[PDB]
Amino acid sequence: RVYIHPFHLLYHNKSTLPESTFEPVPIQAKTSPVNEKTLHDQLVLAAEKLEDEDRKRAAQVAMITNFVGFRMYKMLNEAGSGASGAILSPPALFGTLVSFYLGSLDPTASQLQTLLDVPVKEGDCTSRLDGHKVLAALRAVQGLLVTPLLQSIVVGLFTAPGFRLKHSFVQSLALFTPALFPRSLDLSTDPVLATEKINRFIKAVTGWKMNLPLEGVSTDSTLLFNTYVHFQGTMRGFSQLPGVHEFWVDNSISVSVPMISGTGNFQHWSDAQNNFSVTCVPLGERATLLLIQPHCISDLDRVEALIFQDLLTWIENPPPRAIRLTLPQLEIRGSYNLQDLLAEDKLPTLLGAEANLNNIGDTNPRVGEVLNSILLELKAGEEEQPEALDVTLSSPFLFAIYEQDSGTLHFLGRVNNPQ
Amino acid sequence: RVYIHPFHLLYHNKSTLPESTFEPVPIQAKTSPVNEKTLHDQLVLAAEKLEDEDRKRAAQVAMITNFVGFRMYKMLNEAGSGASGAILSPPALFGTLVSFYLGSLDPTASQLQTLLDVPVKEGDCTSRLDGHKVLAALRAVQGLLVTPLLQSIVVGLFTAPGFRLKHSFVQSLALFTPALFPRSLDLSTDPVLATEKINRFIKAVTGWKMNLPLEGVSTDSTLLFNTYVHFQGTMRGFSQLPGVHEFWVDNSISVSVPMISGTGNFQHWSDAQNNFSVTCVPLGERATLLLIQPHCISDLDRVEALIFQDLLTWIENPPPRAIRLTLPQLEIRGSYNLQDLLAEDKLPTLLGAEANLNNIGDTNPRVGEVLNSILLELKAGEEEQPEALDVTLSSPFLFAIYEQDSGTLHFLGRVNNPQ
Ligand code: NA
Ligand code: NA
Ligand code: NA
Ligand code: NA
Ligand code: NA
Ligand code: NA
Ligand code: NA
Ligand code: NA
């Protein structure tokens, strides 16, 4: 029975030419690849010129982001995320939802806000989220995160030939990420080839090897909204160990995988109440990798449901200590359709055919997939060539990436089998 | 051989989705009338939050505005402005030209800048005017002027059915005035009726009785750009005198017209060198009416050519003195086609059929008329119910309205016959 009241993210006072449109260029059209460094430098500036007001908006956006992330993570696990584990980016999902919110009118608008856990007072427009404020706060926490440390979000907006996008909608989207690619293509004749073209396009414009889904697009789709997230962070002072080392996928089965290892002054503790432990490794001045180990493999589900389901009161802050950390080199790929997660959440028609998204384009779109896809890379900072506590991740565990100032969780996940 | 070097109005560093467009609604579509008070309050805010930088940009914009105003005033008189006299609004003309500049590409762009007396260095984009800076400085001097004192500029942008305007162009225009009315109508079948519809539209949306030209629009026109200016100022302490009083239209002919009269501490002097005199009456805290009388009627042309043709070094600043000023109540209406003034200036094809205005819409427009039309009203501040110098305007004279801080001339003109 929880409710978030993000005052600083609402409209505050209750108060016209025809809207301009364009037609996106075909998906075939030659496009320069995304520059991740450029993106990174932009994001860092947005974070560097923050007022107190901005910090307040950022703390409120973190609350909305985290809550919907935990909720959708739960939905993902209910639906089944595959063998290797699970990964979800609350910022990316939240941004996707806020983008639809900006393109939506009631009843869809209010339903989206209700899903974000913010009360709506019918008749009262000053009770509504200001999506531009929201996306501006979300950009700022993206920047705070990355103060060689990369977080790139690119959006593929794929539309049927002849569907025209509203300028205002697309300009709103740029606040989510400037790496935005509206492209048209035939979605009505060969769904599987359309997905091939989309997957080929994204790989060419990003250079990321993401292992994207192959399933075809529904033939009546006029609009797809796909969000692609690349996170890269270097583990300073970590190097790959020689050889291969047993990783227990369960109590009777092991895989022998490459491990990285390093010693630093990290935070670590054991939660007595629920019998798990946590280790925190800094990834930058504001970014923290949390690594959560259950006491035994069969307790993983209980621990995961506990720590990932709203205020992270489980995050403690002990004095750092000398820890030798050993863990699998993490190269994590995941993808889901937000449509499926919404259906799992008993909201199958929220972005359905009757959704009012009349502020997206010149006609109401028919939304096909809304994909969120991730490539997360935790690289060893040193090439493979002192008393400390040994922490060794050689059975399934949970992880989160966390921004200290706002408290935004940028990723949450579970590793069952690192490959 | 004069040149203006407005550094603060140039682009400074030498450094994409399809452009969005809309189709203007038909001229028949129901429209609320312009609110002059609302406009006035907006303009006053823009003037109230000015930095030093803004003041520098405003002083440079005044120079460009005044120079093109004097030049076009000369062209107007060469072409013949009718019987009653002449009136021209440099800000309105300048804003019209800067608006075309924003919609233009080379060679038209550079030709427009050259007409504004600012050097162009081919290959060097940092030598170009930044039209957004320019229009932002022009808005600020509009506001400074009006700190019951009104200066309203409304723009009628009339386009052939099916011609689509670029969002970016129209957004640029809003910086000139937010009172902007893009409307479509058939220009190809009945030119005279089209002008009737335009004239009817402007009167309905403004309430101003302007006595607009009746001549038809050329049949191949796809775009008309008409600017309409209403100035209203109250002469504090002036009241209409009883009866009618002789006004000499020349040495042998008089008309008996109503006069207003009032006594105040105004500035006044005689220019010995060229044998004319000037009186300055404040209209607000920053606005000044200048009234220039030749010594005799036959010298008017020489005096007009002298004072209106670049730095107003003729404007003096003596201590004010007790003056009884008597003059005709001024209700001045004027209209010209900037196309005609450009032709008079030997630039007939500058906004001609080969003009590159490809940033205005989805096709290159064919520009018909570019009208500037004025209604200037100087009302007596008191209803008709002490030693001073008598100044009485009972023969032809010149007038200007002038903003003190920037030195922008908002109007210049000549009265031969007040009605
Ligand atoms: Na606020
Ligand atoms: Na718009
Ligand atoms: Na607060
Ligand atoms: Na909004
Ligand atoms: Na400047
Ligand atoms: Na645009
Ligand atoms: Na200067
Ligand atoms: Na410009």
Short mmCIF file of C-alpha atoms in Angstrom, two decimals, chain A residues 37-51 54 136 139-147:
data_model
loop_
_atom_site.label_atom_id
_atom_site.label_comp_id
_atom_site.label_asym_id
_atom_site.label_seq_id
_atom_site.Cartn_x
_atom_site.Cartn_y
_atom_site.Cartn_z
CA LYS A 37 32.63 9.02 -25.60
CA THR A 38 30.62 11.99 -26.96
CA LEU A 39 27.49 10.74 -25.17
CA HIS A 40 29.60 10.27 -22.05
CA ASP A 41 31.01 13.80 -22.10
CA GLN A 42 27.50 15.27 -22.60
CA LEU A 43 26.07 13.29 -19.67
CA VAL A 44 28.98 14.35 -17.46
CA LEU A 45 28.25 18.06 -18.14
CA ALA A 46 24.53 17.65 -17.33
CA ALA A 47 25.64 16.15 -13.98
CA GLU A 48 28.28 18.82 -13.31
CA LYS A 49 25.92 21.84 -13.33
CA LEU A 50 23.28 20.63 -10.85
CA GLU A 51 21.46 22.98 -8.45
CA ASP A 54 17.93 19.46 -9.50
CA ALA A 136 15.52 15.91 -17.10
CA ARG A 139 19.38 12.46 -17.48
CA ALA A 140 21.07 13.98 -14.41
CA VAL A 141 21.28 10.65 -12.54
CA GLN A 142 22.65 9.02 -15.73
CA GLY A 143 25.44 11.63 -15.58
CA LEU A 144 26.10 11.23 -11.84
CA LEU A 145 26.58 7.48 -12.43
CA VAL A 146 29.42 7.93 -14.92
CA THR A 147 31.43 10.64 -13.15
#
